[PDB]
Amino acid sequence: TDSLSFSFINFDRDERNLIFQGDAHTSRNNILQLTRTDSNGAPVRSTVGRILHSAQVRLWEKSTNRVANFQTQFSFFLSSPLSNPADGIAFFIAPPDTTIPSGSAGGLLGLFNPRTALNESANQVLAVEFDTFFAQNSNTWDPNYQHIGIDVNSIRSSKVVRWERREGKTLNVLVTYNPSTRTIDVVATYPDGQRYQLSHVVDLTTILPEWVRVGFSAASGEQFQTHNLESWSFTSTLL
Amino acid sequence: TDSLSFSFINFDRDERNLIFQGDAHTSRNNILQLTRTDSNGAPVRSTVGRILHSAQVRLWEKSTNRVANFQTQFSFFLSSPLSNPADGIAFFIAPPDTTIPSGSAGGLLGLFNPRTALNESANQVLAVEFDTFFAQNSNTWDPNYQHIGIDVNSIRSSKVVRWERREGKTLNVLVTYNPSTRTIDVVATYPDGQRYQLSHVVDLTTILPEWVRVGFSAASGEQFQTHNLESWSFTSTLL
Ligand SMILES: CO[C@H]1O[C@H](CO)[C@@H](O)[C@H](O[C@H]2O[C@H](CO)[C@@H](O)[C@H](O)[C@@H]2O)[C@@H]1O
Ligand SMILES: CO[C@H]1O[C@H](CO)[C@@H](O)[C@H](O[C@H]2O[C@H](CO)[C@@H](O)[C@H](O)[C@@H]2O)[C@@H]1O
Ligand SMILES: *[C@@H]1O[C@H](CO)[C@@H](O)[C@H](O)[C@H]1NC(C)=O
Ligand SMILES: *[C@@H]1O[C@H](CO)[C@@H](O)[C@H](O)[C@H]1NC(C)=O
Ligand SMILES: [Ca+2]
Ligand SMILES: [Ca+2]
Ligand SMILES: [Mn+2]
Numbered sequence A, B: 001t002d003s004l005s006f007s008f009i010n011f012d013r014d015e016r017n018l019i020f021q022g023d024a025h026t027s028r029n030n031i032l033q034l035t036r037t038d039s040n041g042a043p044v045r046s047t048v049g050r051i052l053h054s055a056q057v058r059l060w061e062k063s064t065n066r067v068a069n070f071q072t073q074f075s076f077f078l079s080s081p082l083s084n085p086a087d088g089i090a091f092f093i094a095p096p097d098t099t100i101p102s103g104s105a106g107g108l109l110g111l112f113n114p115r116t117a118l119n120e121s122a123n124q125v126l127a128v129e130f131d132t133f134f135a136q137n138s139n140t141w142d143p144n145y146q147h148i149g150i151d152v153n154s155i156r157s158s159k160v161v162r163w164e165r166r167e168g169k170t171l172n173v174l175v176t177y178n179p180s181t182r183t184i185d186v187v188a189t190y191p192d193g194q195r196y197q198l199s200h201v202v203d204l205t206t207i208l209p210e211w212v213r214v215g216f217s218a219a220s221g222e223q224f225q226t227h228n229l230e231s232w233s234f235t236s237t238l239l
């Protein structure tokens, strides 16, 4: 596979190219609802949902020292009745057989096991997190504010920028990887022009295997919110 | 899925996004060898191989009357010691669960069952065939010359154009579907400029289900040749 691209303007109840994990489901409004809701659509405690595209990405080739670039765009909104809604949504990249770790329903965002969430040698994941919950006695790795973070094999972000959750409002995001500069760049905006930018230098060939899957994860622990993925496009080329 | 694209500059022995059926395999020269070879690489009798991309294409949407377009490019060469090498290679589109029919190793090109190969109501397939074998007492549906054909639910092509097989030589092909004119167009060239063109009006929403897979099939019966797929790119958008 030397190039791969796909897009979801919205999400289809009869989709065939998504792997659904945990509580992820497609709503009647063509929204990918990652986390569990009750019969009235209200968010509930202790839930993880994830999606991965069924098509795998060749991120690099050992035999030839080629590396892929990628560009991905997505939009989402979060809703909750709580003053401290939790826990957040992340774009992520992981080995193709990745599954939801035990104990990941909460501040580990469906990406990490509590026993190894800070142990880089035990993980293989790149994530861009939109983290709404930062209580310092439970999310001890977090900054003391809502934030966007680039995560490399750890729930402790390598880089963060302060971010403002806006109840019910859509955030649009562009994430790119440049293999020649080994840079992940993140740009996120709200419709009124409020902008967030974050970057981190990481050689993805050192943290991920040759073939990966890409997708999204979200979770709630004892505090909760819906995590509503509205759209997603992805392009990759193996230079 | 509102758009899907992928490409193979050549073929990877460690590919992850191809469904291999029958004798299809990837050679040490990064060639997709569809049909069976012996230990010396020589083609053998009575073999079918097919590949399908693992990602499914939404060809149309019943709920919304949207229809996809697609453009696909590929190249292949055929090799054989015989005066009458057989049987040919086809690009095809079929339901996602499609498998090799029994008795398809020969002039049915790995696409049809002998009992229903001419019964349109029993099939769901669009194929563009490159047919090298036309003996009139066994391939009774064929023109009496080598040909490119557009096949709609039948091994008897809806449209044909005379074509010249060239031993060991690469043919480059572009196939497109225009949903507004419901036209399949085929253009094939050899490096010296020799050109072949063929088109056929067929409403794909009337012959194929909403979700399909795309790929290639080749077969040999009592006469034989290798069917060597060199490259393949595919793009589709659901307008
Ligand atoms: C009200 O819940 C907060 O206080 C509790 C007691 O200190 C914590 O157990 C609780 O942590 C869990 O919920 C959060 C938010 O969903 C989650 O981030 C964390 O991983 C735990 O699941 C929370 O701090
Ligand atoms: C020498 O084989 C030709 O003559 C035989 C006797 O008439 C046929 O059985 C034979 O047909 C089978 O092979 C061809 C070529 O591979 C294939 O197109 C056909 O479907 C049969 O498998 C062939 O005509
Ligand atoms: C980190 O994880 C690896 C693999 O599970 C393990 O060998 C190592 O001991 C762990 N480190 C700590 C400090 O637990
Ligand atoms: C064609 O196929 C259909 C479905 O298998 C069958 O009902 C029909 O009788 C077939 N026609 C003939 C002439 O065999
Ligand atoms: Ca957190
Ligand atoms: Ca034939
Ligand atoms: Mn965080």
Ligand SMILES: [Mn+2]
Pocket (backbone or CB within 6 Å): B129, B131, B141, B142, B143, B147, B149, B155, B157
């Ligand atoms: Mn024919």
